[PDB]
């Protein structure tokens, strides 16, 4: 009797967790009452080093807001607790013409760019990117909702026919940096060093508002090159920072939901395939004892598997021993059991 | 007892392999005398409907080449033993001051890019690129060694412009192109720039060229693209544009691939590009331990890769970087990622 268990795990301790409040050991002092009942994570791991998480915050929202937490870790098995803090609940989109939808689909493309990748590099951070434009025109922040305000990419327009601005990606292995439009001009970022080319030109679409699309490139280091046709340029301002390769290592994603009265979506869940990634969720609604979004018995005891090592990771689930079992681990990492008669 | 074995296998029937004259049941009609000695195949297999494989020729070669052969197969695992049909040995550059360097990175780029979506498709076949280029100029083939002519991509020559269409598959392999260095005009020095453009989703993949350490030939990248209509431009003269693509259909369950070294005798330069396009988790790479001594002649019919290919004779449960576990239940290595059914190491 050793089934596949329903949680995130590692072999060993050289585990790194990213997450939110419902993780974060730092936001009890924050809220009245002071205890640590809002969090899934157990308390016991707060001064475990391995955990980097914010209350209200999310790589992808850090990723493209000025409401920034520069997320930083490094591990063999990376496991992602986080998500929520940008969903369609918060109902964002640049304008009001805008589309949520849009910023769904760009959420579930920057997700998957960063688990396949996380399954081959230990570390993450954040850097800034150095950007540089003769066209001083400033930025405006066009695209606004509530207190989230866009500053990745960021806008350019002409002052003292064709735009044009440097940006230097240094420092890593690999970044992730996103290249956008509005769904009549193109967008081009050009590698100076290598000669490659990744561009967009604006095409219609039936079933969407007029919002801005976003691709996300895994790019090597070097100079480049932001260039328009047209009025408008973008170009990024900050990057998701890869470093240190390594043997390939699935990651651990955990659904990261609000309680069903708010809206949440299952974008993560996209993004979270085999054979770079495991996808855990409870069997029931996000029901939190601190209030009803933080603090639940499902999304507890899928993280109170970070409190041990075990030997097998798989898609079913975890296996805490590695000899013998009822069923055959799926996508394995780890020594793991037979499932045959002996 | 139950060690990691140095073959390729199969899980059960659902299977396929890509070859060249070491697995080409056919040829034996064309050589004298007709023994299939040349094989590292075993000739009981000829007739499983499972092998697509031509003498003298590699998927590489016929994507980017005249002597073309429609490679054509279907199978939840797939292998390859084939690539020795462009190497070193072969020597091809375009002009003069050509670089078999560049071929090589364009090799390993192309089966980078074969076996990462073989591990997601169960079909394998080749489609003709067709395009619309309204100019006076034809389609001409500048680049060629030996019997070795260039025709994928295309190179027109009178801004200048062509259409080109994807259908057929779910994805394609197509080539994008251009030399590096920049090439001279009056005076003035400009760089080779190519971009193609999905007119449907609006994405726009482009080269330009820059300065590198002589050896002034063709660099290609090999996107892996959706159905649509496209636009290949070019901000130079000439003008290049897909004639072939590789057609991946019917997306399956993630599956490694099997890739057996294709070289030479040591007598003859091979190279090791397959071996660098198989990395974990989506492909497994078998070699011999020795040299390839063959019996039909020096190149055809070794002991060591008779060996390899003849797990293909039977059923084999668990697959892995270390090799082929043939029953499930009990072993002394712990599988490294592992396809199957796989044993365990620990003690019962
Ligand atoms: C070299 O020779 C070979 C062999 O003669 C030639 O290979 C053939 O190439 C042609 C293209 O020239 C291919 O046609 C296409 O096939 C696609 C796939 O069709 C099959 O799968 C479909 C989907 O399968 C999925 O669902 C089923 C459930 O129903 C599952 O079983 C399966 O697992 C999948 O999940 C099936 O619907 C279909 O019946 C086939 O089984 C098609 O997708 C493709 O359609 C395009 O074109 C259509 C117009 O006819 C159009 O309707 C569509 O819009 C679409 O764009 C098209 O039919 C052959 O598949 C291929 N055969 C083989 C054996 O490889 C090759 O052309 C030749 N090359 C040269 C250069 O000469
Ligand atoms: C991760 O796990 C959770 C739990 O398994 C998944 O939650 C389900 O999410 C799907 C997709 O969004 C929902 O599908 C909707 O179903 C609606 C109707 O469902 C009724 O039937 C269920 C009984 O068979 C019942 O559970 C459900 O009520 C639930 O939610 C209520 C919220 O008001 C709550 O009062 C109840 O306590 C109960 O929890 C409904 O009566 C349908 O109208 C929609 O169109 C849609 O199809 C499921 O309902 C969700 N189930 C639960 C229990 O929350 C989640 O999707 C998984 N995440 C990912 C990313 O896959
Ligand atoms: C598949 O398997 C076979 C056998 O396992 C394997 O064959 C080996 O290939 C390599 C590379 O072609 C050969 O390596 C040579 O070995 C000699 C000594 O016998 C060395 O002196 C050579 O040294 C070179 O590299 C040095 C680096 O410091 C240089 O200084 C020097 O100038 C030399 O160029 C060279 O490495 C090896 O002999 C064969 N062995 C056999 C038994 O054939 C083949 O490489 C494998 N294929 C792949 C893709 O891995
Ligand atoms: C070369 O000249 C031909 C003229 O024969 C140009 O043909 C044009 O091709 C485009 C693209 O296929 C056609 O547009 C398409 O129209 C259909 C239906 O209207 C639509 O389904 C497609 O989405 C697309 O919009 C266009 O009609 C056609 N023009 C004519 C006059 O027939 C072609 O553009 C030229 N190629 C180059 C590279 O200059
Ligand atoms: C899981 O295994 C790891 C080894 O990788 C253990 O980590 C060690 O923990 C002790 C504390 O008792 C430290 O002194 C060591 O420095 C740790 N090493 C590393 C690499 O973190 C960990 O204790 C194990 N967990 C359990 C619950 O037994
Ligand atoms: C990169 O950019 C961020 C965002 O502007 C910088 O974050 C601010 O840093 C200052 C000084 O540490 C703080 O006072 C602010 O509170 C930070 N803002 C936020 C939203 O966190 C960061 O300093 C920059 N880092 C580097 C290395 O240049
Ligand atoms: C996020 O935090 C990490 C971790 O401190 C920062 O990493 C430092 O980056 C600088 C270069 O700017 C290096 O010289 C340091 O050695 C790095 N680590 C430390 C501990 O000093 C990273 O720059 C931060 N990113 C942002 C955007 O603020
Ligand atoms: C931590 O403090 C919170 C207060 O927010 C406690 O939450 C209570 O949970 C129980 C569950 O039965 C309820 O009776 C209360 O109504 C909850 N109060 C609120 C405001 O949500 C929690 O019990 C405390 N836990 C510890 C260990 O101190
Ligand atoms: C794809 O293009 C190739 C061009 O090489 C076609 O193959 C040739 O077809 C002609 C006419 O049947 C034959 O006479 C030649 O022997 C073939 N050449 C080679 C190298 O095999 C092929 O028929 C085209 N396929 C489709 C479906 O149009
Ligand atoms: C598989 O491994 C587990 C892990 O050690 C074994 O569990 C032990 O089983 C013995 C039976 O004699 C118990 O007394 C111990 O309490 C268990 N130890 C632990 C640490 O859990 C299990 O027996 C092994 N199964 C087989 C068939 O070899
Ligand atoms: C979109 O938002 C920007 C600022 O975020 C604003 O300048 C612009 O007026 C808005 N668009 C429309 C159509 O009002
Ligand atoms: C902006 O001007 C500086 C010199 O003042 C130059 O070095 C830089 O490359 C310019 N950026 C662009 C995009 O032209
Ligand atoms: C792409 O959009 C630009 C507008 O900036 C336009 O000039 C061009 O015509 C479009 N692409 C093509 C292939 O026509
Ligand atoms: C995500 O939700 C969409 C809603 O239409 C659904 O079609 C899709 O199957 C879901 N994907 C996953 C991985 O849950
Ligand atoms: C596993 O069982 C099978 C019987 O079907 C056979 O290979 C053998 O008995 C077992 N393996 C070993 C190594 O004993
Ligand atoms: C084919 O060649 C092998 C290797 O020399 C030889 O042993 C065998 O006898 C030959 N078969 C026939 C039918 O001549
Ligand atoms: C490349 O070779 C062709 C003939 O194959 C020759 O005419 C041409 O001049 C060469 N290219 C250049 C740039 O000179
Ligand atoms: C590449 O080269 C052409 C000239 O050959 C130049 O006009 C074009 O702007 C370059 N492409 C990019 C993206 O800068
Ligand atoms: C291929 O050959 C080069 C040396 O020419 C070597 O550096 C590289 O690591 C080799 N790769 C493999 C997979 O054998
Ligand atoms: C492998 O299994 C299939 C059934 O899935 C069977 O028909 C076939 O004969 C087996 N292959 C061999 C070589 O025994």
């Excluded at 072999?11 to 205890?35: A, K, Q, T, Y």
């Excluded at 098995?77 to 989109?93: D, L, M, R, S």
């Excluded at 688990?115 to 950007?131: G, H, I, P």
């Amino acid at each position: 009797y050793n089934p596949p268990t329903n949680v995130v795990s590692h072999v060993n301790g050289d585990w790194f967790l990213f997450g939110d409040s419902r993780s974060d050991c730092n936001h009890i002092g924050n809220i009245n009452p002071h205890n640590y009942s809002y969090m899934d994570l157990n308390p016991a791991l707060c001064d475990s080093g391995k955990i980097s998480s914010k209350a209200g915050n999310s790589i992808f929202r850090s990723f493209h807001f000025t409401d920034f937490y520069n997320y930083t870790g490094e591990g063999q098995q990376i496991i992602f607790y986080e998500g929520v803090n940008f969903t369609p609940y918060h109902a964002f989109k640049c304008n009001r013409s805008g589309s949520n939808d849009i910023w769904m689909q760009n959420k579930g493309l920057f997700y998957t760019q960063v688990y396949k990748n996380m399954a081959v590099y230990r570390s993450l951070t954040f850097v800034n990117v150095s950007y540089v434009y003769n066209g001083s025109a400033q930025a405006t922040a066009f695209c606004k909702s509530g207190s989230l305000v866009l500053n990745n990419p960021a806008y350019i327009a002409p002052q003292a026919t064709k735009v044009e601005a440097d940006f230097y990606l240094s420092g890593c292995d690999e970044y992730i940096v996103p290249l956008c439009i509005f769904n009549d001009h193109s967008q081009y970022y050009f590698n100076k060093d290598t000669g490659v080319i990744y561009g967009l030109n604006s095409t219609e679409t039936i079933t969407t508002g007029f919002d801005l699309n976003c691709h996300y490139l895994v790019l090597p280091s070097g100079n480049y090159l932001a260039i328009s046709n047209e009025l408008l340029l973008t170009v990024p301002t900050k990057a998701i920072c890869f470093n240190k390769r390594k043997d390939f290592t699935p990651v651990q994603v955990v659904d990261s939901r609000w309680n069903n009265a708010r809206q949440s979506d299952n974008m993560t869940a996209v993004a979270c395939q085999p054979p770079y990634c495991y996808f855990r969720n409870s069997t029931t609604n996000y029901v939190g004892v601190y209030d009803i979004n933080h603090g639940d018995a499902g999304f507890t005891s899928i993280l109170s598997g970070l409190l041990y090592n075990s030997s097998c990771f798989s898609q079913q689930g975890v296996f805490r021993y590695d000899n013998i079992s009822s069923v055959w681990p799926l996508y394995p990492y780890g020594r793991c059991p037979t499932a045959a008669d002996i």
